[PDB]
């Protein structure tokens, strides 16, 4: 998403200090200023921060849609500073309970691919082939066709 400007303005010193240290480690001369994300990940690994890196490497293999491979500040800088948990409040548990109860038109304790497709047609998103399998992963942790409310809670918890 486009949180890039608010993020470059919003970071507080607890992570800004390490950002500056990583900047010093990164840029020592004869650099274009784009800050290559390949060296950035190694530098942050050297810093001792403990987020998840494999998603970042895959993203760089995909994200920055033009396929430049040298991410400018926004996206790879976010992936770097993603050590800190600036989440979307996790929403509210009661809100999601009310939503899931609303979605349970079957009134059988769970919502399956038919109801998900019904809601998607109600909103009108681009049809994805990752469907079915996404429900199997998130909601079907028991391989039984049953999905409780915590599965939907952790499906999009703190999503921006």
């Amino acid at each position: 998403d486009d949180i890039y400007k608010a993020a470059v303005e919003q970071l507080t010193e607890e992570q800004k200090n390490e950002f500056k240290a990583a900047f010093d480690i990164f840029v020592l001369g004869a650099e274009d200023g784009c800050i290559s994300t390949k060296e950035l990940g190694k530098v942050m690994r050297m810093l001792g921060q403990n987020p998840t890196p494999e998603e970042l490497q895959e993203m760089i293999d995909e994200v920055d849609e033009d396929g430049s491979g040298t991410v400018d500040f926004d996206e790879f800088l976010v992936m770097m500073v993603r050590c800190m948990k600036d989440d979307s409040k996790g929403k509210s548990e009661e809100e999601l309970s009310d939503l899931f109860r609303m979605f349970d038109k079957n009134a059988d304790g769970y919502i399956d691919l038919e109801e998900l497709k019904i809601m998607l047609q109600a909103t009108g998103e681009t049809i994805t082939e990752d469907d079915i399998e996404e429900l199997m992963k998130d909601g079907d942790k028991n391989n039984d066709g049953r999905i409780d409310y915590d599965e939907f809670l952790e499906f999009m918890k703190g999503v921006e």
Partner: protein, 74 residues
């Protein structure tokens, strides 16, 4: 048990809520306002009862979901 305490509490609530029974001793407007206010009160009580019924059905469904959870734990 679970048959007499409910009855006594209900009778006590009836006594405290059903006020003094006296109408024809006063003017038409005072009785008209009293009847209108009591009718609006019973309308509020009925609306609250139906809302609590819908909430009870929702919480019965939630209890069923939590039952399915405790069944999934075994």
């Amino acid at each position: 048990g679970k048959r007499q305490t409910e009855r006594e509490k209900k009778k006590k609530i009836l006594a405290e809520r059903r006020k003094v029974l006296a109408i024809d001793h006063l003017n038409e407007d005072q009785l008209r306002e009293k009847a209108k206010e009591l009718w609006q009160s019973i309308y509020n009580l009925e609306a609250e009862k139906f809302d609590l019924q819908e909430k009870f059905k929702q919480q019965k469904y939630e209890i069923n979901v939590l039952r399915n959870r405790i069944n999934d734990n075994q």
